[PDB]
Amino acid sequence: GAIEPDKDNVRQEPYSLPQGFMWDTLDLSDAEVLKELYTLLNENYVEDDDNMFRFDYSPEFLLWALRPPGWLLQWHCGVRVSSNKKLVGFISAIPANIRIYDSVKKMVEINFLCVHKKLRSKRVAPVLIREITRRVNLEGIFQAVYTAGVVLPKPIATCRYWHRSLNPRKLVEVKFSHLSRNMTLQRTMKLYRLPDVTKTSGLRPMEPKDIKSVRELINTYLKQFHLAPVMDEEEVAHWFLPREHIIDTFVVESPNGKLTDFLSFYTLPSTVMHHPAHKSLKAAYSFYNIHTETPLLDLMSDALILAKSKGFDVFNALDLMENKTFLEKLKFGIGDGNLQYYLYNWRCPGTDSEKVGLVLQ
Amino acid sequence: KVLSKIF
Ligand SMILES: CC(C)(COP(=O)(O)OP(=O)(O)O)[C@@H](O)C(=O)NCCC(=O)NCCS
Ligand SMILES: *C(=O)CCCCCCCCCCCCC
Ligand SMILES: [Mg+2]
């Protein structure tokens, strides 16, 4: 359970930054500030282990990820250089109802912790963590969930990335992938060829009228996992209604009209930092895929077909939920990255990745 | 948080 009880005293004044820095609460409704945050992340956020790719979250994507129902302006915490007002730090919290084993707790999800490359090792990130903790506590929330590539003490789970090539030649050219150990490039491309049309009957984009049904579908499905979100109708609409270049959700409407399944994946390109011919890698990420009548394998096959039809170069997925049941069959290849999940102020046994039912952007 | 590539 909780390590420390809900506090009886929380600091009311912001924590002190090092000299030369100032706090700024970012209002992403100001296109100027949203562009500043986009630039910060596009130039300084997470890169692959060999520094060839760097996340390229779009401004619209940041709006989708950072303002779900109940979002708070004070939880978009930025840090600027005082002398020239340049944005050099950021961290964010968004509210969520998170079920850990049997306990449904109001928590925050922490994300987008980023400090400018030139202003690192100045102990800015620890102050950012303290300050977001303070701002969350003052709203009456004392647990958090988050993910990281770094191995910190006592993760609740470790998940592995897998990758399904959709544009093998490009992936090989930019060194995201490599030539098969014993096949020509051409035979590799033939190996990963997908059908031109989906197979599942009744597969169609999600629409507003689907909200409640989708809610019903996900909250039931997620019951089997040890860590998972619990979503109300507003949250379902936010996280799953299609937004072009951001989030795609397809539902399976049975003949009578009931929804029986749905698949979803979000759009998250990577900058290719040093290639003479390629500047970006278009990647889809598996989000939440719920099955009650369609086999999960056919579901994810259709997901791959749709991502391909939409011009994606690769389809990524973690080995959580039931994903291990289709990863190898659908020709995913194991990635070189591990994602750890962590709970703040909650002590509980760790679990396996297939018992993790939470996906963060 | 993690930008994985094919191993
Ligand atoms: C990890 C982080 C934020 C530390 O910044 P810092 O201000 O130099 O921390 P300090 O070493 O001074 O305690 C910085 O290296 C960074 O922004 N890396 C890229 C973003 C990232 O990896 N976020 C993941 C959160 S674990
Ligand atoms: C990626 O951006 C996650 C970075 C998480 C850093 C540690 C966050 C610790 C919890 C802070 C919020 C506490 C609210 C009770
Ligand atoms: Mg620093």
Residue numbers in the entry:
A (entry chain A): 136 to 496
B (entry chain C): 3 to 9
Any passages from the paper?
Co-crystallization of NMT2 with a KVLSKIF peptide and myristoyl-CoA resulted in a 1.93 Å structure capturing the myristoyl lysine peptide product, clearly showing that the lysine ε-amine, but not the α-amine, was modified. Furthermore, the simulated-annealing omit map unambiguously demonstrates the covalent bond between the lysine and myristoyl, concomitant with the loss of electron density connecting the myristoyl group and CoA. Interestingly, there was little electron density for the adenosine-3′-phosphate of the CoA bound to NMT2, suggesting that it was either very flexible or hydrolyzed at the 5′ phosphate. Including or omitting this moiety made little difference in the R-free value, so it was removed from the final model. Similarly, the region from Arg115 to His135, involved in binding to the adenosine, was also flexible and thus not modeled, unlike in previous NMT structures. Following that region, we found a long hydrophobic pocket (~23 Å) that emerges from the active site of NMT1 and NMT2. From the Lys3 Cα, the pocket is approximately the same length as the myristoyl-lysine pocket. In our structure, it is occupied by glycerol and nine waters, but it could potentially fit a myristoylated glycine (as modeled in Fig. 2g), while orienting Lys3 for a second myristoylation reaction. Main chain contacts between NMT and peptide substrate residues 7–9 are also conserved.
There are two human NMT enzymes and they have been explored as therapeutic targets for malaria, sleeping sickness, common cold, and cancer. Unexpectedly, we found that human NMT1 and NMT2 can catalyze lysine myristoylation of ARF6 providing an explanation for its unusual membrane association. We reasoned that the ε-amine of lysine could sterically mimic the α-amine of the N-terminal glycine and therefore might react in the active site of NMT. To further understand the new activity of NMT, we obtained X-ray crystal structures of NMT in complex with lysine peptide substrates.
